A paper describes a structure:
Actin isoforms are among the most ubiquitous and abundant structural proteins that facilitate the functional organization of the cytoplasm of eukaryotic cells. Actin isoforms share high sequence identity at the protein level (~93–99%) and the propensity to self-assemble into helical, polarized filaments (F-actin) from monomers. To determine the structural characteristics and differences between actin isoforms, we solved the high-resolution structures of single-isotype skeletal muscle α-actin (3.37 Å), cardiac muscle α-actin (3.07 Å), ß-actin (2.99 Å), and γ-actin (3.38 Å) in the filamentous state using cryo-EM. Our 2.99–3.38 Å resolution structures of filamentous actin isoforms show that the N-termini of bare muscle and nonmuscle actins have different orientations that contribute to distinct binding interfaces for myosin motors and likely other ABPs.
Specifically, we used our previously established Pick-ya actin method to recombinantly produce human ß-actin and γ-actin in an engineered Pichia pastoris strain that expresses the human N-acetyl transferase NAA80 and histidine methyl transferase SETD3 to ensure uniform Nt-acetylation and methylation of H72/H73, a conserved PTM profile of vertebrate actins. The structures show local resolutions ranging from 2.1 to 3.5 Å for skeletal muscle α-actin, 1.9–3.3 Å for cardiac muscle α-actin, 1.5–3.0 Å for ß-actin, and 2.1–4.4 Å for γ-actin. For ß-actin and γ-actin, we could resolve the entire N-terminus starting from amino acids D1 and E1, respectively. Specifically, the presence of resolvable density allowed us to model the entire N-terminus including the Nt-acetylated D1 (D1Ac) and the Nt-acetylated E1 (E1Ac) in the cryo-EM reconstructions of β- and γ-actin. The acetylation site on the N-terminus is exposed on the filament surface and adds an additional negative charge to the already negatively charged N-terminus. The presence of both key PTMs in our cryo-EM reconstructions emphasizes that our recombinant human actins represent bona fide post-translationally processed, mature nonmuscle actins. Superimposition of bare γ-actin with γ-actin/NM2C complex shows the subtle inward movement of the D-loop with a Cα RMSD of ~1.25 Å in the myosin-bound state, suggesting that myosin-binding induces subtle changes in the barbed end groove that do not change the separation between SD1/SD3 and SD2/SD4. The negatively charged N-termini of bare ß-actin and γ-actin are near loop-2, a major element of the actomyosin interface that is rich in positively charged amino acids and variable in length. Furthermore, we observed a cluster of positively charged amino acids (R661, R663, and R664) in loop-2 of NM2C that may interact with either the acetylated N-terminus of ß-actin (D1Ac, D2, and D3) or the acetylated N-terminus of γ-actin (E1Ac, E2, and E3) to stabilize the interface.
Residue numbers in the entry:
A (entry chain A), B (entry chain C), C (entry chain B), D (entry chain D): 1 to 374
The structure:
């Protein structure tokens, strides 16, 4: 008589997005933090709570300590992590998770001690009829409507690439880097002490993160800008703190995003973001390199810096031979690319035969996810 | 009022040609390979097939393993071989094989365990009204319009000669060599590692084969060219890979085709291609040697190397006595010589009495081919 | 008045061994790496060097980047490679290379652009009175004191086989595979992320390599062990990192060495180590296959895994016909088999007439090595 | 208590037999082949010879090319042929040929350019005191102890008959055929490709020859056996190759020896072995035909096929008139019949006056053999 749908929860590491299948945008988006008070309080006639989750913690962050339940794509705290899902199902979507299947996302090359515990939580605490776990990068390709190209995923905790030629994925060419937005925010705080501003409290870290995504951009030619910025002052901008003071940042605007292409700034030795894509392609066969060069897809929040498309094209061209053409495909909605691909996949007619049923969990539940989602 | 035609299928070993009788060119030509995927695939919304046959496999050869159903003129796989014929009858010629007789070709000195199974397949699976099997080399003589001369057949798996004086064939002078294009391609890969290029995958073998038939030629004087090529550099050519890189080959241009005249390079002890023709002629009677010397006919794909006619004339002259004249007849269309001869033979007025009827198969079908085609 | 000896330098790809002729063991063994600092340093009163070569780099590897001058048996860097030889001649053997002939080793089927540059370095920079280059696998047979059998060489960069019947070698049966210890170490790092341990730095790669040669073994029956290891826990061992933490590895003990017999794990399509030996033997004549089956000789560092002799016998028996007996000869000192054979060869009375003299280099020096060592 | 031993060699074409006079069996028997290496060799510490003669070549035939110095009873190579005699005199009989007369055998109707060169070799290189040349077939009659009958000689290169009535020989009735064991071996290789086994190398020809003299027999009624062999399978036998594989031959057991009675199989037009004997007898006078019919003597290696005596009796009876009785005399030791007759002849008291002395050679040596041995 009625019909059902499927929830898509792109958990990620740093921001949680939830919604219903069939739509083109998430319904609820909120940062994933857990805060606790650190004082005693003197007032008696107040309904003082014990823990704040989600947007509420972002409001009263002057008297709390904020802790992130997920670090580098691997969840470390489970008591706090249970609270995040409990908030999403009840106070945001207002849907009881007992008749609607759930779909999750998870980064590649992670311990399968993680995927085991995800099965235990949702099949015991909430008792969902079905669930499935998919790679984040693969879902990004569904949004573009294409089945050929190498996808670059760069969220807040991890950065990985996976090539797909045509309906097949090569598992031996997957790479991974532990360099993402969290490392850039800590780097910006280190170099913002240059002008006399010092932020040390975890509450003040949120203020620094806001500056990063409001005034930073990637320079087309790094060396030329430093000469220009040193002489004149046309690149200086002013920002206003919540306290009322005004701060001005000069050459720091493009020094922070430049760390993506030169990881040597942070003290880590590794290839840049542009060189990782080149190495991934060269690990494929000789007849696939032509199509992959003409289809490169970007995704993730970190990629949203203005002018990042032009710089990536220049870097790849100098490395690849001059005969073929290099094209970077950067859709304007790349921030929600992962979530949209999840909605399309869960609505396919032929995908309904791949769910993990409640009956299957009864026999070898903690180990079924390894083989059925391989 | 309505007449039926006859299909000619020069199966060969390495390339299949099909067409209708009465024409001067085959209608469908495609390599005979069968490919299967070797990965798992992650995409759901794709019509992923299980096996690719013919030109389709040559397109997506970056994710497949290619296997040849025929090796050295003897078919080894029958499940894959059935697929090749099924593709030819339906998806290329678009004719139902239930009212048109079929004609095949087959190399001499092969096991008649082979010709038995060919009868079983076409008289049970497709139920053709009639069929006939003929020697490949004999059909080549019909195209030239002559009935006197020794024909040299050199395809991709076998190389054989058969002399015919006048309307009669001598069965005791037929020779055979297991040296053909497949051995040359493997030899080229072995010596192409000299300059740093290494091809090992079966998909990369197709790239090496393309180079062979685009840049190789036979030298008139082998020893003189090596002295010339070593000093100067006017014999160097450049080729472009599908990946975009450029490769240059020097003295390797004529080292590969030279293996035909000196089989000692490959580690096999045997006479060269030129010496085999001499030995075949000397096995005939004393009054036939004059006419055979003045009519030598070449055929097959391997013979298409430029400058092979001049070298063969020089080799034979040094062996035969100086009195008679040696002439090598190399028509410009020798690549399709076998097929054209099949079309003419099937259209003869007096050949219609030699078909193998469906009634004859009922009594001693698996054994009738031995006596009726003798 | 005095007498001369000959130095033997089994260069290999990954470890260098040097010594004097007539002995039974190398005098100096050290890894072949070159390291450079990646920081600036603040201390003034220190004798800070610019580059570290050999065992010194292995000590202070916490602040250096290690680079291998040789990859896959083909040297890529010559400035760094010159440093390795300079260290060996002076700081380890303490002998001036101006009166003692030198002997080298080199893998088969390599570009002879390589052997040309080896001649240039030793005849100009050091000016050695004589030198000679020999195949690695052939030298291994001298140590066994036998002249009949197929030798399997598996070092760190290459894996090749060459058959020798009796005093003669067949050059058309030599095979080669690009699968060696370096590929196994990278594979172990990929699957060691399963339990939460992540090594990414080139300095941390040396730690992973140490685990491989201290806790890994080859299982007699691969499928049976997985069933046993999954249920019980008697196959688990513990290892201690330099930092102090303890790590435990379960079924990963035998999953890494199993990649030798099934190259499909790494994404490469090729025959296993056992199947390559079978194909090499079948390329010989019909009367040689009996003696080669009864004499198989192993060598190289990779072959030192416990229990590899028993597994190889089982694999060959299933392929070869049951009549003959299969014997695998694995001497306990197979790690130094190549070097010992070099010492014996350089001490033979009849070998002194095959050196390349300084006079010969003056005429056609860069090209004499091709013909005199053929 | 003293005599001059005689060395008696029945050179033949395909096998050499040597021994001393007065014995009943040859002392040394070995195939007459000469082999040379066709590779280069890498080993230094080996006593590698340049040419192998006799039984040694039969051992290491996997790396050599075997050449027969004698073809069709006419020696073609003299440098190789000198080596065969040098081996026999020194390394097998261990007797210096300077005091013992030598006796040879030679087929009839051969060029007396041959017998001239035999005189030159033994009277210059070895300087034997005396020598004599005799017809092979005549010597066969001495072994039987009879002086009336027609002898059939069929070795490996030639087949000839000569009638002798009583103490006299008729020179105008001698016949000759170029059909012997060598033609049968080549025929067997041609029809053994029927079942999929292909032997092409000269080393593999020796394996085919071994099968011929171990599993072949002559059928009493050719047409009846084919009907029997086609229906049932009681005539199939299995043979084991040196490699270990097993092969089975069906009706090929008696198809090869049948070519002797029907030369039309090989493409040669001639009378059979049975018809040649009939034609030879009919060339004699009318009063001799009765005794010759009752005494037919066989000899040679080719005649050793089982059941050849019964078939020959049936063939002759149908041709000759029914009045007289036909008897075929086939002694069990017919393989050494020629040699034994040589031993008896050289020991006769009245034969010592027919030697060719060293003094006679000085005047007209190259021409004395024509008249003194007429
Ligand atoms: N406009 C922007 N410019 C730069 N960085 C941005 C921008 N918007 C978001 N980010 C970065 O995106 C990071 C999170 O990316 P996101 O894709 O939301 O993570 P996840 O993949 O876990 O959902 C933040 O930590 C922030 O630094
Ligand atoms: N232009 C060319 N130059 C050199 N070789 C060629 C050329 N065209 C075809 N060949 C060779 O001819 C072979 C094809 O022979 P084919 O006609 O298929 O014989 P068959 O039909 O008996 O199998 C291929 O293996 C290829 O190497
Ligand atoms: N005990 C061991 N167990 C497993 N592997 C080993 C052991 N000892 C050495 N190896 C492997 O052998 C390799 C060394 O090979 P080596 O003898 O240097 O070859 P080459 O001299 O040709 O370079 C190392 O990479 C290492 O992985
Ligand atoms: N048992 C046998 N069955 C069949 N053929 C045989 C047998 N023994 C020997 N032969 C044939 O006889 C030949 C040997 O003849 P041989 O006595 O050497 O003649 P000659 O001495 O004149 O050379 C061989 O080629 C072999 O084929
Ligand atoms: Mg994301
Ligand atoms: Mg052809
Ligand atoms: Mg080694
Ligand atoms: Mg004889």
């Amino acid at each position: 008589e009625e019909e059902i749908a499927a929830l898509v929860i792109d958990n990620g590491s740093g921001m949680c997005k939830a919604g219903f299948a069939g739509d083109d945008a998430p319904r609820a988006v909120f940062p994933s933090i857990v805060g606790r008070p650190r004082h005693q309080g003197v007032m008696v006639g107040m309904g003082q709570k014990d823990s704040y989750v989600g947007d509420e913690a972002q409001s009263k962050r002057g008297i709390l300590t904020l802790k992130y339940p997920i670090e580098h794509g691997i969840v470390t705290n489970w008591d706090d992590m249970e609270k995040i899902w409990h908030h999403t199902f009840y106070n945001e979507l207002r849907v009881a998770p007992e008749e609607h299947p759930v779909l999750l996302t998870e980064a590649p090359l992670n311990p399968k001690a993680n995927r085991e515990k995800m099965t235990q939580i949702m099949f015991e605490t909430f008792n969902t009829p079905a669930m499935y776990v998919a790679i984040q990068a693969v879902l990004s390709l569904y949004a573009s409507g294409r089945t050929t190209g190498i996808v670059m995923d760069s969220g807040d905790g991890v950065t990985h690439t996976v090539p797909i030629y045509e309906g097949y994925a090569l598992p031996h060419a997957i790479l991974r880097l532990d360099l993402a937005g969290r490392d850039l925010t800590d780097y910006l705080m280190k170099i913002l002490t240059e002008r006399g501003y010092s932020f040390t409290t975890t509450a003040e870290r949120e203020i620094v993160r806001d500056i990063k995504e409001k005034l930073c951009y990637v320079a087309l030619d790094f060396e030329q800008e430093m000469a220009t910025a040193a002489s004149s002052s046309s690149l200086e901008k002013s920002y206003e703190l919540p306290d009322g003071q005004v701060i001005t940042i000069g050459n720091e605007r493009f020094r922070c995003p430049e760390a993506l292409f030169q990881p040597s700034f942070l003290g880590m030795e590794s290839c840049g973001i542009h060189e990782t894509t080149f190495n991934s392609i060269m690990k494929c066969d000789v007849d696939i390199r032509k199509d992959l060069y003409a289809n490169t897809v970007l995704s993730g929040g970190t990629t949203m810096y203005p002018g990042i498309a032009d710089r990536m094209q220049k870097e790849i061209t100098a490395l690849a031979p001059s005969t073929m053409k290099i094209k970077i495909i950067a859709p304007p909605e790349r921030k929600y690319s992962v979530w949209i691909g999840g909605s399309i996949l869960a609505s396919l007619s032929t995908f309904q035969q791949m769910w993990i049923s409640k009956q299957e969990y009864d026999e070898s539940g903690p180990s079924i996810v390894h083989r059925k989602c391989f």
